[PDB]
Amino acid sequence: MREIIHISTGQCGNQIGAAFWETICGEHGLDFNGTYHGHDDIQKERLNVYFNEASSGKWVPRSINVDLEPGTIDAVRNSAIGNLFRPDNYIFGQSSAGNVWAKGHYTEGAELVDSVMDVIRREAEGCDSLQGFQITHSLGGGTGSGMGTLLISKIREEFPDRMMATFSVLPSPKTSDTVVEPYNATLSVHQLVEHSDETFCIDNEALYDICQRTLKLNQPSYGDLNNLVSSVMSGVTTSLRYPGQLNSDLRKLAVNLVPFPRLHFFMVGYAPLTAIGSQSFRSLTVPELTQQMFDAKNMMAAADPRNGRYLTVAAFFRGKVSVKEVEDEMHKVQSKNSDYFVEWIPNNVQTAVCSVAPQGLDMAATFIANSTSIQELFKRVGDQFSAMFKRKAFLHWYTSEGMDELEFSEAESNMNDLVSEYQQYQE
Amino acid sequence: MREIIHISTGQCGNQIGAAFWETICGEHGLDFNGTYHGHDDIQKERLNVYFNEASSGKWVPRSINVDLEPGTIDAVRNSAIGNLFRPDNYIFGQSSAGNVWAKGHYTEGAELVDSVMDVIRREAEGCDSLQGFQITHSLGGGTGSGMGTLLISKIREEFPDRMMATFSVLPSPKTSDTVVEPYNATLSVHQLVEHSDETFCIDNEALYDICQRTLKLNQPSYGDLNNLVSSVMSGVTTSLRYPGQLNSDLRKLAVNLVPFPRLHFFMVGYAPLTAIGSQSFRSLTVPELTQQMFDAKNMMAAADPRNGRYLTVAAFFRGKVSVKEVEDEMHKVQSKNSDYFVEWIPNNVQTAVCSVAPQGLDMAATFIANSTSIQELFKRVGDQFSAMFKRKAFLHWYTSEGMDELEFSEAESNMNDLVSEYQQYQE
Amino acid sequence: MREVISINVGQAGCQIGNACWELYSLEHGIKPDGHLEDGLSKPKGGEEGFSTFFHETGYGKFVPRAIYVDLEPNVIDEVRNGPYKDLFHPEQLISGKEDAANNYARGHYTVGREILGDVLDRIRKLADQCDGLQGFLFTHSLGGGTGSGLGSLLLEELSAEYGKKSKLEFAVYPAPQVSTSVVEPYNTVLTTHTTLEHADCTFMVDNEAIYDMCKRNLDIPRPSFANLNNLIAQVVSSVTASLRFDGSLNVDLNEFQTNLVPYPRIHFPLVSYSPVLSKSKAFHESNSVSEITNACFEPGNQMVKCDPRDGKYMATCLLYRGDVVTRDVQRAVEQVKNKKTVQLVDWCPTGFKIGICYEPPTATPNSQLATVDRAVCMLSNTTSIAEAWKRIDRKFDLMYAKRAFVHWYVGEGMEEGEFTEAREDLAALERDYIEVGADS
């Protein structure tokens, strides 16, 4: 069970998967057409894992892109890097989700679900070493918030043995193009908290902040954020991509990162946050990376670990580092942050070092934390919930959609269960 | 008994035989002027099987072309392969049967059946190693469904020992221009069940669906469908002609592919079926063809595995294939399709392998099955007959023909008896 | 009693086995090809050794008898890439596609028992090929629960199979301070009872002590797992020095069994090796043998995170390499007895066994080592082992209070009853060890 499929959905998650494939072929080395150029054999095994070896030495990525508006998938198919994409990889329909939780799955998904399950079954037949799915979608995007939850429930019902992994981006609470976006986000997480075993929190506002601080650009570019999250995904999967002193499986990471079936939410952090021109000012050292992993705003989830409570933490590194040095550093930061770190474990640390280093970086790090402050990131949305349809504005739209107050109360009760778990386990 | 005769009649079966000879001369490589170009020894044997050693090393394929319109023979003469022919190889009368089976095989058929039977007796005297008789005609058109039926009856009366390969085309239920089409079809099959011993279900609508899903053609064209059926017909005869790990003969199927002699219908399926332009993405493997064979979308009969219970199945392959791979695939499909696979066999499998690579392909496969979905088409055509001749519209034509309705009830009751045989054996 | 079967279980166990085979090749000057390597000696093989670990073939090529078992395909591919796989037989190694669990759940489960019969018939065929047998050597880390459970299963199967040769098991212990794996104490505690039921003799080594040693003795800034592997290879070679190379006082494995087991249940010896230092300081400093004997009692050389002074002395052995004067080591051990560093008991006290071997110690190029003509390997039975047991058991109980994870174990292959039983077994073992050590 070494192979993994990267699922793609959402009007924005498709670009995320595209950037992920681009970063993969740029890191390991691959032609846009599909001719193998990596070195030497472990990268060939990872090509077997993520790609299918086509005829004439060609490779095709094992990704499932399912969204609406096929114009976007056709345009991104016209890209140079996206030339090795198989026509069976993307299964798109017409035409738009309207940014509503009902039309995403309750109306349109019911007719494409059979086709997408046929596609995923053909994929599972093509490769039997599949162990998990990597899904990138928009929790606020209509296509995402609609189709992702339905497909995840379908996979959970049909493939309970296979693992789950998602990278849904959370809608910003302060700014929103429309008020229905966090509503659809809540209606989707109502089932995502049940049918998912692993998820990563991503906030666009945190991305804007980190590119204003590091990239130092006034108007953030979504392509650069795609590049950052793709580098994060690559540093996450490097545990299987490159053999190191200790390589772990996603199940081994999960059983140690959660004590209970809950806690699928995870706080993300990447290092080094290299600013343009700062490559000469600063030198790559592990204390600086640890400090960046400790910064509340450097996280892209994003939550304040000081206000919260460290439940489970895990920083996986890449490059040339010393085991004794990193053990000393982790002991120092657990002793000095004993108030933040939970103490009855007592060691909630899980570090996995990669032998090779990412291209352009002598050493890198990906930190995943679990804090209790994340409830606030839920509460506001839930608050917005009770702040948006308490006026009953545009409720006729949802009544025509067929939605009822029972599922809204169920989503609110799921948020209540989440915060109670956040307080069980008091912060 | 390697020599096999081919007979072509009907409005479309003429083009079917034309495409068959095109594929024949393309398999080994041959000029349309009778110039030998194969290498080295086998091709001369297949010439002696199908062609005739004329003067100056010439080769003319042994085919009997007959139709009520000389425009058809003019059109097939306009083609390169098949332009030249001995005038005795084809006899054409005038003028039309009015899409009537009774009139077709009563008036249009009886006046030329004498000459064509004399001709075929002459060629049977010339061909000593004759074993089977491929038939290319159209069951939809009354002209073909009457003429070819009468000819098959006369051949069965003359050559009861020689095989009869019937590749007729079943009518499409969507076509409602002429309601007499399914009626003529059922009256023709009611006799061909005893006149012919090997028949293959072929639906025009199935061909339209497969060319719209794989070739994605805008308007259905008989050219590509005839190319496909010619490839399928050439594969089953090259399985015996061309050397392989296991050749298959018509007697082998007559003794193995069918349990009881009252069954003569054989479903069809071809692989690989690659979309236009996606041949670069496709890699010829055993599992993909195995999956294609057990799908109704890839069949051209077209019977549904999910609908009809399997009595028996057979899959023939060409090119370099391993016995272990096909054995594993057969075991897997027996484990998963045990519901359709009937219990009294209990394991139904018939395999044949051709060693040489297919023309333009590395491996090509054909599939035949005997399922309980053909009785569904029988019920459909019987209901069509009943609902059409309940109105008593256009029945004055057949009263002028002289046929009796008692014979029609007998034909329909015999078809219902065959359905009950396919219900013994319940679905 | 001329052959010893060595087994490599788990990732760390496989790496340690690779290091030991490389060091065994280096001592006898054996190259990847060999054929012996080459045929001129006497005593590099033949004669013995190699006749204890390397299987003799009709062509003369010495095949190191090793069985690399792991369900992680990456480690198996890694060990197959090297020339060690060419040295071993392709059928001796066992491969697994999916790792058992994290870490002891499936390693001890029936899924880990499926290959038990396969490896058992492999061992039976290997014994049929060779002639004679002295014991079974095991190499698996107690930190890795997969390797722990697999090694315990193999030990139980071998005890039920032959039960005629002493079962040796080299166990690697995690650092008592920090633990990367959260179920590591659970796996270790559950494995302790199995090893008590199966193993005739044990070996307890700590990674943190090895790291402190190489940082202090070798003066290295960056420790490595390869350096730990090299040090454990040097240790294991120091154990079987007399069995491979002849010496003035050749010692037997049964002698180890007699010395290390002076009671119904005493099979936990601690290992110490001296002198160990950087090669530069070895070129700069030249100590005496009494200084080496004293350094054997230092907390660093004991390879354990426990002070040896609080421990109570029991029957110990000391192997010596190269040229060693009997009168000198007699004077040194008398001076040590006069020092009374470790508190002696009333049963054992005159319990210092001395064995001499002509083979001088060898220093690997990857890890520094004090270049000296004579080395000292002391296998002691002090009572700091009870201290380490209590140290790990306190954390085990603190966890098992809430345990945060019991659902996975009770659903896969275990139950809280087994955990409580292993806890009570460890407590009873600690109590018995403290009792037998305190009655003096």
Side-chain angles (χ1 to χ4, degrees):
Chain A
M1 300 303 180
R2 68 168 189 174
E3 296 172 320
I4 308 172
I5 301 181
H6 186 277
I7 319 295
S8 168
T9 181
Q11 85 288 350
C12 297
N14 45 12
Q15 316 302 133
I16 303 175
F20 173 73
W21 290 119
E22 291 158 359
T23 49
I24 287 300
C25 52
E27 173 70 27
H28 78 261
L30 189 67
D31 193 70
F32 66 97
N33 173 262
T35 78
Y36 180 78
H37 300 297
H39 294 329
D40 199 5
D41 61 347
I42 47 175
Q43 294 180 341
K44 190 176 307 176
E45 304 166 340
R46 307 321 180 278
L47 262 288
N48 291 33
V49 160
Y50 281 148
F51 294 68
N52 277 330
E53 167 59 32
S55 303
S56 51
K58 204 203 305 177
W59 292 99
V60 288
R62 294 211 280 267
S63 45
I64 305 301
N65 206 333
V66 190
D67 283 312
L68 303 175
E69 188 53 41
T72 59
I73 195 67
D74 292 329
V76 306
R77 190 57 174 84
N78 306 137
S79 54
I81 307 299
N83 284 330
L84 83 168
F85 291 171
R86 177 178 65 258
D88 305 330
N89 278 327
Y90 49 95
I91 304 299
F92 272 56
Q94 286 193 124
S95 198
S96 198
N99 201 7
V100 62
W101 186 78
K103 197 197 304 178
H105 79 302
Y106 197 82
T107 82
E108 304 190 57
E111 300 92 24
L112 212 65
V113 58
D114 52 6
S115 57
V116 304
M117 295 323 287
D118 294 354
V119 170
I120 201 178
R121 275 169 286 184
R122 183 210 67 256
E123 292 291 337
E125 292 157 345
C127 298
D128 302 334
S129 159
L130 174 61
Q131 64 166 352
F133 303 95
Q134 304 165 171
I135 315 185
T136 60
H137 57 287
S138 44
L139 192 64
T143 54
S145 48
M147 192 71 258
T149 179
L150 191 61
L151 65 90
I152 283 176
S153 45
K154 275 294 183 175
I155 295 177
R156 178 55 47 191
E157 294 161 10
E158 298 190 20
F159 311 96
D161 52 353
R162 297 302 96 188
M163 282 301 301
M164 218 59 178
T166 50
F167 314 88
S168 199
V169 57
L170 317 180
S172 45
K174 295 174 294 182
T175 182
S176 88
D177 197 12
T178 176
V179 295
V180 67
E181 162 178 2
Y183 196 78
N184 306 323
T186 304
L187 289 183
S188 45
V189 300
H190 157 68
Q191 312 165 177
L192 292 185
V193 298
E194 306 297 329
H195 299 278
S196 159
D197 303 332
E198 193 283 309
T199 186
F200 288 116
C201 320
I202 294 97
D203 190 11
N204 293 320
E205 202 72 21
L207 304 178
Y208 309 151
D209 302 331
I210 64 179
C211 57
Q212 190 63 65
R213 168 170 55 255
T214 62
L215 162 68
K216 308 149 188 173
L217 188 57
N218 42 11
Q219 39 175 3
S221 159
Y222 179 71
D224 308 336
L225 316 180
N226 294 329
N227 305 330
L228 292 181
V229 308
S230 304
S231 61
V232 170
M233 282 184 290
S234 315
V236 163
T237 187
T238 200
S239 45
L240 313 180
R241 282 194 55 185
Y242 302 96
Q245 316 304 132
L246 173 61
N247 290 35
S248 157
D249 198 13
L250 79 165
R251 276 149 291 191
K252 309 178 65 178
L253 302 170
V255 298
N256 310 335
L257 206 52
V258 297
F260 286 159
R262 294 303 181 94
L263 207 79
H264 319 104
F265 44 87
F266 294 127
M267 292 175 52
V268 292
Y270 161 75
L273 299 178
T274 297
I276 295 93
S278 61
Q279 303 84 13
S280 45
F281 280 166
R282 331 295 163 190
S283 198
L284 260 174
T285 53
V286 296
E288 181 177 357
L289 301 188
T290 311
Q291 291 169 130
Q292 299 318 302
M293 293 322 199
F294 267 104
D295 185 79
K297 314 308 162 184
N298 283 8
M299 303 297 104
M300 307 80 68
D304 194 1
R306 304 181 305 175
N307 302 330
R309 164 164 299 278
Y310 286 160
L311 309 179
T312 51
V313 298
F316 320 107
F317 320 100
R318 315 184 49 176
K320 316 303 162 295
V321 305
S322 198
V323 184
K324 188 51 184 175
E325 178 184 14
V326 68
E327 286 184 21
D328 297 328
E329 295 292 335
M330 75 181 65
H331 186 50
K332 289 173 183 58
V333 304
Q334 286 195 228
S335 45
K336 71 179 186 181
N337 305 286
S338 315
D339 307 359
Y340 304 143
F341 284 99
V342 71
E343 295 171 326
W344 65 266
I345 307 303
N347 295 331
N348 49 327
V349 57
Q350 180 184 11
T351 55
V353 64
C354 202
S355 51
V356 303
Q359 320 308 317
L361 300 177
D362 292 331
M363 53 189 58
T366 57
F367 178 56
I368 292 92
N370 276 314
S371 199
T372 49
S373 45
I374 315 176
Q375 58 196 342
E376 311 299 325
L377 321 180
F378 300 158
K379 287 163 184 175
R380 50 191 191 189
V381 183
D383 295 357
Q384 291 169 329
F385 199 101
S386 279
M388 278 160 179
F389 271 7
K390 217 59 61 186
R391 326 284 185 83
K392 275 68 193 173
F394 282 160
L395 191 61
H396 51 280
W397 281 5
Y398 267 77
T399 61
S400 45
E401 292 295 334
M403 308 302 108
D404 311 324
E405 282 288 339
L406 57 95
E407 67 171 16
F408 314 150
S409 44
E410 283 155 12
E412 187 166 337
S413 181
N414 288 120
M415 280 188 172
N416 300 331
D417 302 332
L418 287 178
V419 303
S420 48
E421 294 155 1
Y422 281 119
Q423 305 288 84
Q424 272 311 312
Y425 291 154
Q426 52 188 1
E427 61 186 3
Chain B
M1 286 304 183
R2 48 187 63 257
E3 297 186 69
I4 293 180
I5 319 297
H6 162 263
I7 320 294
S8 184
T9 185
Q11 61 278 0
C12 205
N14 54 8
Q15 318 297 333
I16 298 176
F20 164 73
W21 294 122
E22 292 275 347
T23 47
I24 288 303
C25 314
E27 280 290 335
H28 43 63
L30 197 75
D31 290 345
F32 49 88
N33 299 320
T35 303
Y36 178 51
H37 282 256
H39 299 276
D40 195 7
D41 59 287
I42 50 180
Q43 296 79 2
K44 301 174 299 182
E45 313 301 324
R46 289 97 182 100
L47 286 158
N48 307 137
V49 159
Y50 276 114
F51 296 76
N52 291 325
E53 178 57 281
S55 68
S56 68
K58 207 180 186 184
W59 295 101
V60 58
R62 294 199 281 269
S63 194
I64 297 311
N65 313 329
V66 53
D67 190 66
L68 311 175
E69 178 62 31
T72 58
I73 191 68
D74 290 319
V76 291
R77 280 188 293 247
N78 291 0
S79 84
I81 294 181
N83 175 31
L84 57 91
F85 266 111
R86 186 173 65 110
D88 314 278
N89 309 348
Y90 55 98
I91 301 179
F92 287 74
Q94 308 311 129
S95 277
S96 159
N99 199 29
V100 179
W101 167 87
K103 185 201 309 175
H105 83 277
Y106 277 162
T107 59
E108 281 76 37
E111 312 315 309
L112 275 300
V113 66
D114 42 358
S115 87
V116 306
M117 284 306 138
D118 301 329
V119 164
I120 196 59
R121 278 183 290 268
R122 297 180 307 102
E123 281 110 19
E125 294 142 34
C127 167
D128 53 352
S129 159
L130 76 170
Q131 177 199 12
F133 284 78
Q134 309 166 114
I135 307 296
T136 67
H137 86 271
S138 45
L139 193 72
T143 74
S145 45
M147 163 164 38
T149 298
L150 182 59
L151 299 192
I152 292 176
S153 63
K154 299 302 180 179
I155 293 297
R156 180 68 56 182
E157 297 166 51
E158 181 51 76
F159 311 104
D161 48 355
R162 297 300 91 186
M163 327 301 293
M164 182 80 60
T166 317
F167 313 96
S168 165
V169 183
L170 318 178
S172 284
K174 173 61 186 301
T175 62
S176 192
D177 300 330
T178 62
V179 293
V180 195
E181 168 181 7
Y183 163 64
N184 296 332
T186 176
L187 285 186
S188 159
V189 60
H190 154 69
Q191 299 179 169
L192 285 180
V193 285
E194 318 306 319
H195 303 335
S196 174
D197 301 338
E198 296 80 10
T199 61
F200 302 90
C201 295
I202 296 174
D203 191 11
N204 278 316
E205 193 60 37
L207 298 177
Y208 306 154
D209 189 15
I210 66 150
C211 57
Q212 288 167 353
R213 69 169 66 258
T214 56
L215 291 85
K216 309 144 302 185
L217 194 51
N218 48 278
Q219 184 174 167
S221 88
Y222 286 158
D224 316 331
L225 321 177
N226 291 15
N227 298 139
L228 292 171
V229 60
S230 62
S231 57
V232 173
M233 288 167 48
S234 45
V236 310
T237 179
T238 48
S239 51
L240 153 67
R241 290 157 38 192
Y242 285 148
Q245 319 308 315
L246 194 57
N247 299 19
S248 198
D249 305 344
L250 300 93
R251 301 158 303 179
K252 304 186 181 177
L253 314 179
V255 304
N256 286 13
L257 188 58
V258 59
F260 60 97
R262 281 307 309 268
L263 167 56
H264 319 86
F265 313 92
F266 307 121
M267 294 151 50
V268 302
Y270 176 77
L273 292 176
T274 68
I276 298 184
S278 168
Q279 284 73 13
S280 198
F281 300 97
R282 296 297 180 267
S283 279
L284 298 187
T285 57
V286 186
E288 60 174 17
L289 311 185
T290 308
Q291 298 154 209
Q292 288 171 69
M293 293 313 187
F294 286 86
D295 294 351
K297 59 188 62 57
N298 303 115
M299 290 176 168
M300 283 77 75
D304 195 15
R306 293 146 287 274
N307 292 345
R309 186 178 186 179
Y310 280 163
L311 298 178
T312 184
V313 291
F316 308 148
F317 299 80
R318 294 197 54 175
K320 169 58 190 63
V321 302
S322 159
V323 54
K324 308 301 296 181
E325 311 176 301
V326 58
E327 279 173 349
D328 300 334
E329 292 288 338
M330 182 261 294
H331 180 61
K332 296 152 200 168
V333 73
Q334 283 188 166
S335 46
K336 65 189 180 187
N337 281 337
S338 309
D339 292 331
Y340 320 121
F341 280 166
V342 75
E343 58 179 8
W344 69 271
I345 298 291
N347 313 335
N348 44 2
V349 56
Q350 192 185 33
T351 320
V353 175
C354 167
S355 60
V356 307
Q359 176 61 33
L361 290 179
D362 293 331
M363 55 180 61
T366 57
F367 187 83
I368 289 180
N370 292 265
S371 167
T372 45
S373 302
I374 319 176
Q375 66 178 9
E376 307 299 326
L377 309 179
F378 296 156
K379 296 169 184 177
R380 297 310 94 83
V381 69
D383 299 357
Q384 284 173 305
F385 159 70
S386 45
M388 282 152 184
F389 277 169
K390 178 257 177 182
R391 314 285 214 277
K392 306 306 177 187
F394 266 59
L395 191 141
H396 43 267
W397 299 82
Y398 279 89
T399 62
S400 61
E401 299 308 319
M403 287 284 290
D404 200 73
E405 270 182 312
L406 166 64
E407 309 147 341
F408 305 158
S409 46
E410 291 158 349
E412 195 171 35
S413 50
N414 294 12
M415 294 194 61
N416 302 330
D417 300 331
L418 197 46
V419 169
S420 316
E421 295 196 43
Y422 306 148
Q423 281 309 116
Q424 292 309 316
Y425 303 160
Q426 292 81 18
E427 181 174 8
Chain C
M1 307 295 287
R2 306 170 310 277
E3 311 290 341
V4 171
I5 293 183
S6 44
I7 305 181
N8 289 317
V9 182
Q11 170 186 355
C14 288
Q15 301 321 301
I16 289 176
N18 299 315
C20 303
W21 293 128
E22 187 195 43
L23 181 60
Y24 285 157
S25 61
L26 292 178
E27 294 172 49
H28 298 241
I30 294 191
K31 78 182 184 183
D33 181 71
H35 192 78
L36 304 163
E37 169 44 43
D38 281 314
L40 77 163
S41 81
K42 313 291 179 305
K44 302 309 180 180
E47 308 171 12
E48 191 174 71
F50 280 106
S51 296
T52 307
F53 304 97
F54 285 24
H55 175 52
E56 181 181 355
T57 55
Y59 304 149
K61 170 59 191 302
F62 281 165
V63 176
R65 309 182 313 271
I67 301 95
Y68 282 72
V69 294
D70 193 7
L71 296 183
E72 188 173 2
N74 209 338
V75 185
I76 318 158
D77 302 325
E78 288 157 62
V79 304
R80 278 173 287 183
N81 297 327
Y84 309 96
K85 197 266 178 177
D86 310 327
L87 294 168
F88 317 141
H89 195 271
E91 295 177 336
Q92 291 180 165
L93 316 184
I94 309 300
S95 198
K97 177 195 175 184
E98 195 258 345
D99 188 69
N102 197 348
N103 222 344
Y104 182 78
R106 188 161 290 103
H108 91 292
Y109 199 42
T110 177
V111 189
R113 292 183 253 262
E114 304 304 323
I115 320 297
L116 272 182
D118 169 70
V119 308
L120 273 180
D121 64 63
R122 169 64 267 177
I123 292 179
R124 292 184 195 97
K125 294 176 301 183
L126 185 55
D128 194 13
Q129 296 176 218
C130 298
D131 52 354
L133 178 62
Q134 194 165 16
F136 289 95
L137 193 143
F138 275 63
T139 42
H140 76 82
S141 57
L142 276 196
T146 299
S148 281
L150 291 178
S152 46
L153 293 173
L154 315 172
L155 212 44
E156 187 172 7
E157 291 299 84
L158 288 177
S159 69
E161 176 50 62
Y162 309 113
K164 301 181 299 296
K165 306 304 165 177
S166 316
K167 283 164 287 301
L168 311 95
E169 192 276 335
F170 289 81
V172 184
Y173 281 65
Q177 312 306 314
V178 64
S179 159
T180 310
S181 158
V182 309
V183 298
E184 207 171 23
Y186 287 177
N187 312 331
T188 309
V189 169
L190 291 163
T191 310
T192 54
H193 175 45
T194 61
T195 72
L196 165 71
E197 300 183 71
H198 313 334
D200 316 331
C201 45
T202 64
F203 297 96
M204 306 78 67
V205 178
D206 295 1
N207 308 268
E208 181 62 275
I210 294 169
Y211 297 149
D212 187 18
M213 287 159 55
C214 52
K215 289 161 51 187
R216 164 177 38 85
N217 307 326
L218 316 183
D219 298 312
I220 72 173
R222 311 304 171 183
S224 158
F225 191 73
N227 305 330
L228 183 140
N229 293 332
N230 301 332
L231 298 192
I232 301 312
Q234 296 153 18
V235 166
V236 175
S237 46
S238 317
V239 189
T240 180
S242 89
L243 315 179
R244 301 174 295 103
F245 286 96
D246 313 330
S248 44
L249 199 152
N250 294 266
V251 306
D252 193 9
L253 185 148
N254 298 331
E255 211 66 42
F256 305 142
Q257 311 303 322
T258 55
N259 297 139
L260 300 180
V261 192
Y263 289 100
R265 202 275 312 166
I266 290 291
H267 55 281
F268 302 93
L270 287 177
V271 180
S272 158
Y273 203 48
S274 62
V276 302
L277 262 177
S278 45
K279 301 181 177 179
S280 66
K281 285 188 175 181
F283 307 147
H284 282 280
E285 323 298 330
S286 159
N287 56 0
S288 87
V289 309
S290 45
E291 292 159 73
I292 302 174
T293 59
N294 298 8
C296 286
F297 291 94
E298 91 186 6
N301 288 333
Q302 298 290 350
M303 314 163 196
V304 66
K305 296 300 297 178
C306 303
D307 180 56
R309 312 291 163 254
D310 55 68
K312 198 134 163 59
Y313 171 83
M314 290 182 55
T316 189
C317 294
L318 293 96
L319 190 140
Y320 302 88
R321 314 191 71 172
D323 45 346
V324 168
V325 161
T326 58
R327 186 52 179 177
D328 286 359
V329 287
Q330 285 164 263
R331 296 152 56 256
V333 73
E334 296 312 314
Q335 292 166 113
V336 161
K337 297 159 186 177
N338 298 4
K339 294 153 198 169
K340 202 76 62 177
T341 77
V342 55
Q343 182 50 47
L344 318 185
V345 285
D346 293 359
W347 294 264
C348 318
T350 317
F352 304 83
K353 176 56 177 66
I354 301 305
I356 317 297
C357 184
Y358 290 153
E359 176 57 56
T362 67
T364 183
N366 186 90
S367 315
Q368 284 199 79
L369 184 56
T371 43
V372 59
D373 55 77
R374 56 181 64 91
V376 183
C377 203
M378 184 184 57
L379 262 293
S380 312
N381 297 326
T382 192
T383 58
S384 294
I385 323 166
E387 313 300 327
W389 293 347
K390 297 174 193 305
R391 166 66 201 277
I392 186 59
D393 202 3
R394 294 320 95 84
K395 306 175 60 179
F396 173 83
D397 307 336
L398 172 60
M399 291 185 51
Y400 187 69
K402 281 77 53 181
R403 74 263 184 193
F405 304 102
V406 74
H407 47 99
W408 281 308
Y409 271 105
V410 303
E412 187 271 344
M414 312 216 65
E415 69 177 18
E416 298 200 344
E418 287 176 74
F419 283 80
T420 308
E421 287 159 15
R423 174 178 179 174
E424 293 150 335
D425 293 330
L426 182 55
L429 284 180
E430 296 157 353
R431 168 187 47 84
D432 295 357
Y433 195 77
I434 290 303
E435 284 159 343
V436 61
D439 188 78
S440 174

